[PDB]
Design a binder for these strands. Structure first.
Lengths: 84, 363, 129, 150
RNA sequence: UUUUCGGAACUGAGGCCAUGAUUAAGAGGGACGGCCGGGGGCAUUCGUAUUGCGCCGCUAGAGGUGAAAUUCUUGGACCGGCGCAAGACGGACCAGAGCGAAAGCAUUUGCCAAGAAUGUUUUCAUUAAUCAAGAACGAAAGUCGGAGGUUCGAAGACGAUCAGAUACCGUCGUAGUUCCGACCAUAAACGAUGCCGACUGGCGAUGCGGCGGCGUUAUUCCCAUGACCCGCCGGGCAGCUUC
RNA sequence: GCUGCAGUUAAAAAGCUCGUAGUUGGAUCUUGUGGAGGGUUCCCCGCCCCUUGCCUCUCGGCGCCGGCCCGAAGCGUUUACUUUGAAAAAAU
């Protein structure tokens, strides 16, 4: 920090670097995504930090496994974020 | 020591451990296999243990860690043993566990939301296994002995799905169970000129003629019965990429099992080319596959003009190897994709269903 | 724990002024802080300021001009009467010619020179010079 | 910092500024209430209903689709329990340490940690008794505690 | 004499109100997920070494000190070999490294209950901070009642040194040193530095969890995941530098 | 030492942790144009939405050719604070 940097207009690379609670206004790092699998093809919605072992509407035994951070998908056809 | 430790808590305490990182993977089969073995006792062992008989065959598929890898032969044997062990119990009584309620013997598993859709799990467990057999047959060298040793299962998948007729309770035969007799024709639609005449030119009068035999001697008549009867029920689905596909398999029946005209008939009734250009590549396989037979059958009748008219479209470019799904990553200065190539190597037809390219070019 | 928010706001400005920084960030915001800042701004000791909405009490960014020698808080909000106000400005101010005590009164938050014109007492909040 | 440990870690959730439902969400207020009523029949506590709904369905915050917090939704149908979520889990933890100490009287760390759990039960019951969630005659007792969770 | 009408009160149907719940703390509690550590209790298991005993070999010294002497030895000490027994202890790896409220905590494997940090668009909604009275834990030494006793060793008996030597140095040795059950409440119990919260410069490392990335290496043929390498964010034991 | 002291080494932080009384405790729920005194917007009247916040009597004077108006009263959720009245020997 120099003597004169203005605090009202952080650049997006200054804001994306810092902790979620310490930004100028708060925002989560997590997201919603839509997920699809082989053998049965009814698309479903998942949260990227899931704690549940998700079962799809296609009745496959595991869609994803839980983990200490992001959940990992069982080689499913999509990891696509929803926009909003 | 007591039955309702066994049939509830001793099940659910392990049955929830499906996908967690702290899972044994082998014991998820074997401890359900003990719960099916420990079943000599009355008011259990003739009946409700069928729930574990379902959940154990569901647990067999997951020893293989991911969906793109094929099942090993040494475990695959148990799937063809154990799907039949389930089906042969459906013979014994007209009454339901793991679905609707009719009798209240020491369980009430009909607390499930819209519970009859649990009964469709028998259809998904066989549909999930018919598709896996293709994954065996794509993954051994066709120029070798092992390929022919793995074709010895292609009758056994038919011997399973043909059993889904005499023993069936869903709503009759006409709600959505009719999937099993699209799965039925997917093992007869290709079957070739010599084999299609085994009851017709190979001695027709010499074979046995009882109702025990006539179920088989119907042969290719089942392949027009299953063209026509259930079109009204398949009209339930709005998905163009499923709805359009059936007719382009069906024409391949008439083209080999009957006269050449009856193939061009069902084709030029239907006008599907602009629709399959809106549909995806695994539907387009059937359009290009069937259209080449409409040319090969024209040559087999001697009408060289309509043979040239049909075959010239496919022969307009050196694409036939990529239309089989087996193209080289490089063969000119053009080729620059790599993200998409492994998707198509997962989405192509098995070896023994290939028509020969030297034959095609000679015709 | 945080027992008082106005003491944080003034200690944060006072440390930034002594380092020579041109801006400072105050968090949490309060109705008392916005009314205290306005009295310093009206007398010419700080520049203009902007408030950020975040759905959790909010934040303020303030612009500094280098004129401020000190600002501070008296922690127990003692009552004052017009007869005793002379003793407080004799204790807290650097000269009779400049600097201000800030009071809260039933006529509002205000400068100790305005409380004499309005003939009113109140409770002490702080001071600046 | 934590009330009975020297630690002062920072981990918590952070909600977005935008309270609105997103345009892609297919669910509607009264169908979300019926899914809540079905999950309550299985004996799931309010903290478990919100994770099943977040992980496997589109609803990130039930309070933004339906204008009420989910313990109120269960209480208005009489589906909520009498003893509240956190006081139930604290009392369930204290009976496990007491079953350990009957055979392991040399474990002086377990003796110390039991004082820190039961003094946290007393602090939380004193709060609920002033807001009329519990009777004025309610009392935790080391002999009775096993009967509170049966 | 009876209605009317006013005052008091139990009680029924019914439409009106935008009909009635502030937010979600870089405050606190509780759930959930995958990990992490000489953290605690019970059982189990291994390793040399030190002392004692049996049998075999060979010959005159061995121990101990600044130098000696007490002591041990031709029915053979010390030294070399093979085998047995008992009680104590966990080297090297071991670091300005980790865990615990502090005192303290290091062979293997299993069983029981507990916990910090991190991840989280879970949940309750002010439940909090610091504390007279009162309460749990608290090195070593010491006291009472049982069991064991290898090594070391207050008191004590002796050999030296010296003016003396009730000491420092040497040989022997009681209580104790180890385990179980009760007591005791102290220490240079130390960062000689109460706890909670906010703000104010720079730099390279290190242990734990998470996030991103080009290569090398290992298992199966990819993918996933382990060992390494380059950055970022929490919170931890510390270091160098600056008017 | 309230204003106003000190506790690494000069005298001095309980060995360590819990805890009742005592002291202390986060954010939030109605404003700008017009006129007087004074300035070149703010303190008194009347207003975007409420200005004593309501209300309708009855014993009791006002305004006018019965009826309708404007000063009491029910009173504004309860207190601290502040400003103003009243009432408190002389001598010092």
């Amino acid at each position: 920090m120099p003597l004169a940097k203005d605090l009202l207009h952080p650049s997006p690379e200054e804001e994306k670097r810092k902790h979620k609670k310490k930004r100028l206004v708060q925002s989560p790092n997590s997201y919603f995504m839509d997920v699809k699998c082989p053998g049965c093809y009814k698309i479903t919605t998942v949260f990227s930090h899931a704690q549940t072992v998700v079962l799809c509407v296609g009745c496959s035994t595991v869609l994803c496994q839980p983990t200490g951070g992001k959940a990992r998908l069982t080689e499913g056809c999509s990891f696509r974020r929803k926009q909003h | 020591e007591i039955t309702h430790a066994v049939v509830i808590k001793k099940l659910n305490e392990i049955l929830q451990a499906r996908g967690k990182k702290g899972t044994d993977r082998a014991a998820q089969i074997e401890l359900l296999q003990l719960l099916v073995q420990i079943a000599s006792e009355n008011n259990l062992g003739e009946g409700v243990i069928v729930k574990i008989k379902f959940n154990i065959i569901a647990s067999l598929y997951d020893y293989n860690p991911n969906l793109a890898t094929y099942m090993k032969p040494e475990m695959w044997q148990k799937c063809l043993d154990c799907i039949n062990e389930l089906m042969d119990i459906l013979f014994a009584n007209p009454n339901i566990f793991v679905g609707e309620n009719i009798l209240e013997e020491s369980e009430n598993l009909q607390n499930v939301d819209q519970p009859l859709r649990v009964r469709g799990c028998i259809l998904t467990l066989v549909e999930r296994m018919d598709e896996e057999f293709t994954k065996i047959m794509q993954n051994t060298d066709p120029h070798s002995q092992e390929y022919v040793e793995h074709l010895k299962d292609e009758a056994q998948v038919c011997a399973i799905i043909e059993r889904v007729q005499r023993y069936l309770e869903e709503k009759g035969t006409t709600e959505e169970i009719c999937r099993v007799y699209l799965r039925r024709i997917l093992h007869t639609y290709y079957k070739f000129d010599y084999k299609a005449h085994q009851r017709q030119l190979t001695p027709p009068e010499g074979s046995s003629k009882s109702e025990q035999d006539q179920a088989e001697n119907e042969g290719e008549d089942s392949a027009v019965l299953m063209e026509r009867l259930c079109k009204y029920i398949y009209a339930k689905d709005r998905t163009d990429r499923i709805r359009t596909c059936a007719i382009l398999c069906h024409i391949y029946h008439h083209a080999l099992h009957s006269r050449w005209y009856q193939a061009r008939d069902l084709m030029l009734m239907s006008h599907l080319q602009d629709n399959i250009q809106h549909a995806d590549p695994p539907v387009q396989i059937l359009y290009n596959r069937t259209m080449v037979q409409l040319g090969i059958c024209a040559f087999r009748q001697g009408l060289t003009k309509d043979a040239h008219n049909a075959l010239l479209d496919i022969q307009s470019s050196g694409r036939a190897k990529e239309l089989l799904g087996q193209g080289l990553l490089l063969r000119s200065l053009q080729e620059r994709n790599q993200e998409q190539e492994k998707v198509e190597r997962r989405r192509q037809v098995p070896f023994h269903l290939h028509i020969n390219l030297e034959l095609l070019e000679c015709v | 724990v945080r027992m008082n928010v106005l003491a944080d706001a003034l200690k944060s400005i006072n440390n930034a002024e002594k380092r020579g920084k041109r801006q400072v960030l105050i968090r949490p915001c309060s109705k008392v802080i916005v009314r205290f800042l306005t009295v310093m701004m009206k007398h010419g000791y700080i520049g203009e300021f902007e408030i950020i909405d975040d759905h959790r009490a909010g934040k303020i960014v303030v612009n500094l001009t280098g004129r401020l020698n000190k600002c501070g808080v008296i922690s127990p909000r003692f009552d004052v009467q017009l007869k005793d106000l002379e003793k407080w400005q004799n204790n807290l101010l650097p000269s009779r010619q400049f600097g201000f005590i800030v009071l809260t009164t039933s006529a509002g938050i205000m400068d100790h020179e305005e409380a004499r014109r309005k003939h009113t007492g109140g409770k002490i909040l702080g001071f600046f010079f | 910092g934590r009330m009975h440990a020297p630690g002062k870690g920072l981990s918590q959730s952070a909600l977005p500024y935008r309270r609105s439902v997103p345009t892609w969400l297919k669910l509607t207020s009264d169908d979300v209430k019926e899914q809540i009523y079905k999950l309550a029949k299985k004996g799931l506590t309010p903290s478990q209903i919100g994770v099943i709904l977040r992980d496997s369905h589109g609803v990130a915050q039930v309070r933004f689709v339906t204008g009420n917090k989910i313990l109120r939704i269960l209480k208005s149908k009489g589906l909520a329990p009498d003893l509240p979520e956190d006081l139930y889990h604290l009392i369930k933890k204290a009976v496990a340490v007491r079953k350990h100490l009957e055979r392991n009287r040399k474990d002086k760390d377990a003796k110390f940690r039991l004082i820190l759990i039961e003094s946290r039960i007393h602090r939380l019951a004193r709060y609920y008794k002033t807001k009329r969630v519990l009777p004025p005659n309610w009392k935790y007792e080391s002999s009775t505690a096993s009967a509170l969770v049966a």
